[PDB]
Amino acid sequence: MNLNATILGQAIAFVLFVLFAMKYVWPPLMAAIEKRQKEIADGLASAERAHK
Amino acid sequence: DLDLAKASATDQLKKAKAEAQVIIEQANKRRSQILDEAKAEAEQERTKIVAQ
């Protein structure tokens, strides 16, 4: 079919989109989930210490 | 609930301290009673002996 220089342009485009997601998108996301988990587990700890 | 646990715990500890104070005070009262009654009893029996 039409194997084209488009394939190489799109390889560079693939790695560029990977880089954009790698630098800007993904790094800022991790913290929220851990904070929300922490504020639920500490309550179970508090109940245990009340009983103790 | 943990706040309630701490409050009741402090109340109970202070109550135990007050009970300890009262109990040891009665111990001291008993000691004074025993000492002075022993002195009086000794004198009573001695006076009886010389009368005899």
XYZ file of N, CA and C in Angstrom:
312
model
N 0.842 -1.187 0.000
C 0.000 0.000 0.000
C 0.881 1.243 0.000
N 0.484 2.272 0.739
C 1.173 3.553 0.639
C 2.075 3.749 1.855
N 3.155 2.975 1.890
C 4.223 3.294 2.828
C 4.918 4.581 2.394
N 4.967 5.549 3.300
C 5.187 6.940 2.944
C 6.083 7.561 4.008
N 6.777 8.656 3.657
C 7.551 9.418 4.646
C 6.684 9.878 5.818
N 5.360 9.856 5.622
C 4.406 10.076 6.698
C 4.676 9.156 7.883
N 5.140 7.925 7.636
C 5.385 7.001 8.742
C 6.484 7.541 9.658
N 7.532 8.125 9.077
C 8.619 8.662 9.897
C 8.223 9.968 10.577
N 7.526 10.842 9.851
C 6.963 12.017 10.495
C 6.098 11.654 11.689
N 5.273 10.620 11.540
C 4.412 10.174 12.626
C 5.161 9.429 13.719
N 6.317 8.842 13.425
C 7.140 8.318 14.508
C 7.649 9.447 15.393
N 8.156 10.511 14.770
C 8.579 11.683 15.544
C 7.394 12.273 16.297
N 6.225 12.323 15.650
C 5.034 12.840 16.321
C 4.643 11.970 17.512
N 4.746 10.651 17.361
C 4.452 9.728 18.453
C 5.343 10.019 19.655
N 6.653 10.149 19.419
C 7.558 10.384 20.548
C 7.338 11.778 21.136
N 6.988 12.763 20.298
C 6.709 14.103 20.816
C 5.471 14.129 21.705
N 4.404 13.433 21.303
C 3.236 13.352 22.177
C 3.562 12.598 23.458
N 4.398 11.558 23.370
C 4.835 10.863 24.578
C 5.600 11.820 25.488
N 6.473 12.650 24.908
C 7.225 13.626 25.695
C 6.310 14.662 26.335
N 5.314 15.153 25.593
C 4.395 16.141 26.153
C 3.602 15.561 27.317
N 3.128 14.319 27.182
C 2.457 13.675 28.306
C 3.423 13.392 29.452
N 4.686 13.109 29.129
C 5.680 12.747 30.131
C 6.085 13.947 30.979
N 6.198 15.124 30.362
C 6.647 16.309 31.086
C 5.497 17.012 31.800
N 4.410 17.305 31.083
C 3.361 18.167 31.617
C 2.184 17.413 32.236
N 1.697 16.352 31.594
C 0.389 15.803 31.954
C 0.482 14.902 33.181
N 1.307 13.861 33.110
C 1.333 12.804 34.120
C 1.955 13.175 35.470
N 3.076 13.896 35.532
C 3.741 14.124 36.831
C 2.850 14.777 37.884
N 1.977 15.732 37.543
C 1.216 16.416 38.601
C 0.032 15.643 39.175
N -0.181 14.371 38.827
C -1.450 13.718 39.152
C -1.427 12.849 40.411
N -0.262 12.336 40.823
C -0.216 11.239 41.795
C -0.765 11.619 43.172
N -0.560 12.865 43.609
C -0.696 13.200 45.029
C -2.129 13.047 45.551
N -3.124 13.430 44.744
C -4.497 13.556 45.235
C -5.023 12.236 45.792
N -4.781 11.141 45.070
C -5.297 9.837 45.478
C -4.730 9.445 46.837
N -3.422 9.642 47.022
C -2.789 9.292 48.291
C -3.328 10.136 49.437
N -3.523 11.437 49.207
C -4.087 12.287 50.255
C -5.469 11.790 50.674
N -6.306 11.462 49.684
C -7.669 11.030 49.971
C -7.694 9.677 50.684
N -6.765 8.778 50.337
C -6.656 7.495 51.038
C -6.212 7.686 52.487
N -5.213 8.549 52.688
C -4.672 8.830 54.013
C -5.756 9.325 54.961
N -6.600 10.243 54.480
C -7.622 10.817 55.350
C -8.762 9.853 55.672
N -8.800 8.672 55.065
C -9.749 7.636 55.451
C -9.104 6.597 56.360
N -7.841 6.245 56.101
C -7.172 5.259 56.952
C -6.924 5.793 58.363
N -6.620 7.091 58.485
C -6.359 7.641 59.814
C -7.580 7.530 60.724
N -8.788 7.565 60.157
C -9.984 7.409 60.973
C -10.113 6.024 61.581
N -9.776 4.989 60.809
C -9.742 3.639 61.361
C -8.711 3.544 62.475
N -7.550 4.175 62.273
C -6.555 4.211 63.344
C -7.113 4.888 64.596
N -7.857 5.981 64.412
C -8.439 6.700 65.543
C -9.451 5.839 66.291
N -10.286 5.099 65.559
C -11.246 4.210 66.213
C -10.531 3.128 67.016
N -9.473 2.549 66.438
C -8.705 1.543 67.167
C -8.116 2.127 68.444
N -7.572 3.344 68.369
C -6.971 3.933 69.561
C -8.019 4.319 70.595
N -9.224 4.693 70.163
C -10.306 4.907 71.121
C -10.594 3.628 71.896
N -10.825 2.525 71.171
C -11.099 1.249 71.831
C -9.950 0.831 72.741
N -8.713 1.108 72.330
C -7.550 0.694 73.111
C -7.419 1.519 74.388
N -15.329 10.722 68.514
C -15.355 9.645 69.502
C -14.019 9.515 70.232
N -12.904 9.705 69.519
C -11.596 9.669 70.168
C -11.470 10.792 71.193
N -12.012 11.969 70.866
C -12.041 13.053 71.849
C -12.803 12.638 73.105
N -13.957 11.981 72.926
C -14.708 11.498 74.089
C -13.893 10.504 74.913
N -13.188 9.595 74.236
C -12.369 8.614 74.943
C -11.327 9.304 75.815
N -10.636 10.300 75.251
C -9.621 11.020 76.021
C -10.234 11.739 77.221
N -11.385 12.392 77.021
C -12.013 13.134 78.112
C -12.392 12.210 79.268
N -13.080 11.106 78.958
C -13.476 10.173 80.009
C -12.257 9.565 80.696
N -11.194 9.288 79.932
C -9.980 8.733 80.523
C -9.370 9.690 81.542
N -9.270 10.974 81.185
C -8.716 11.946 82.127
C -9.584 12.061 83.374
N -10.911 12.063 83.192
C -11.802 12.120 84.348
C -11.574 10.934 85.279
N -11.443 9.733 84.710
C -11.249 8.535 85.524
C -9.907 8.557 86.252
N -8.847 9.015 85.581
C -7.541 9.095 86.235
C -7.580 10.058 87.419
N -8.196 11.230 87.227
C -8.301 12.190 88.325
C -9.144 11.635 89.468
N -10.223 10.918 89.138
C -11.049 10.303 90.172
C -10.255 9.284 90.979
N -9.430 8.481 90.302
C -8.584 7.528 91.012
C -7.609 8.244 91.940
N -7.049 9.369 91.487
C -6.150 10.141 92.347
C -6.870 10.634 93.602
N -8.087 11.158 93.436
C -8.844 11.648 94.588
C -9.180 10.518 95.559
N -9.586 9.362 95.025
C -9.861 8.210 95.879
C -8.612 7.775 96.633
N -7.454 7.811 95.970
C -6.202 7.486 96.646
C -5.938 8.442 97.800
N -6.161 9.739 97.574
C -5.972 10.719 98.640
C -6.856 10.399 99.839
N -8.140 10.122 99.589
C -9.064 9.845 100.691
C -8.676 8.561 101.424
N -8.314 7.515 100.677
C -7.988 6.227 101.287
C -6.755 6.356 102.177
N -5.720 7.036 101.679
C -4.503 7.188 102.472
C -4.746 8.115 103.662
N -5.637 9.100 103.511
C -6.003 9.937 104.649
C -6.668 9.114 105.747
N -7.566 8.201 105.368
C -8.155 7.315 106.370
C -7.110 6.394 106.987
N -6.107 5.982 106.208
C -5.009 5.204 106.781
C -4.284 5.992 107.868
N -3.998 7.269 107.604
C -3.334 8.106 108.603
C -4.219 8.316 109.831
N -5.524 8.494 109.614
C -6.459 8.615 110.730
C -6.429 7.361 111.596
N -6.421 6.191 110.953
C -6.335 4.929 111.678
C -5.034 4.835 112.467
N -3.921 5.276 111.872
C -2.642 5.229 112.578
C -2.676 6.089 113.837
N -3.184 7.321 113.716
C -3.262 8.201 114.882
C -4.165 7.607 115.958
N -5.316 7.071 115.543
C -6.230 6.418 116.474
C -5.527 5.300 117.233
N -4.830 4.424 116.505
C -4.170 3.282 117.134
C -3.101 3.752 118.112
N -2.278 4.719 117.698
C -1.178 5.165 118.550
C -1.694 5.761 119.856
N -2.621 6.721 119.762
C -3.059 7.385 120.986
C -3.927 6.474 121.857
N -4.725 5.583 121.251
C -5.474 4.633 122.065
C -4.535 3.670 122.780
N -3.446 3.256 122.123
C -2.480 2.383 122.780
C -1.838 3.081 123.970
N -1.491 4.360 123.810
C -0.918 5.112 124.927
C -1.888 5.168 126.107
N -3.148 5.524 125.833
C -4.137 5.631 126.904
C -4.369 4.286 127.588
N -4.464 3.211 126.801
C -4.676 1.877 127.354
C -3.510 1.460 128.242
N -2.284 1.761 127.804
C -1.103 1.455 128.601
C -1.161 2.147 129.955
N -1.469 3.448 129.958
C -1.553 4.169 131.229
C -2.661 3.614 132.120
N -3.803 3.262 131.526
C -4.915 2.721 132.306
C -4.512 1.429 133.012
N -3.866 0.517 132.280
C -3.464 -0.756 132.877
C -2.371 -0.561 133.930
N -1.441 0.371 133.690
C -0.390 0.653 134.671
C -0.970 1.171 135.987
N -1.891 2.137 135.893
C -2.517 2.682 137.093
C -3.283 1.601 137.844
N -3.966 0.718 137.107
C -4.637 -0.401 137.761
C -3.643 -1.283 138.515
N -2.466 -1.532 137.932
C -1.486 -2.397 138.590
C -1.005 -1.777 139.899
N -0.715 -0.471 139.899
C -0.238 0.119 141.161
C -1.362 0.172 142.201
N -2.604 0.394 141.758
C -3.725 0.326 142.689
C -3.828 -1.059 143.316
N -3.655 -2.104 142.504
C -3.657 -3.467 143.026
C -2.513 -3.695 144.010
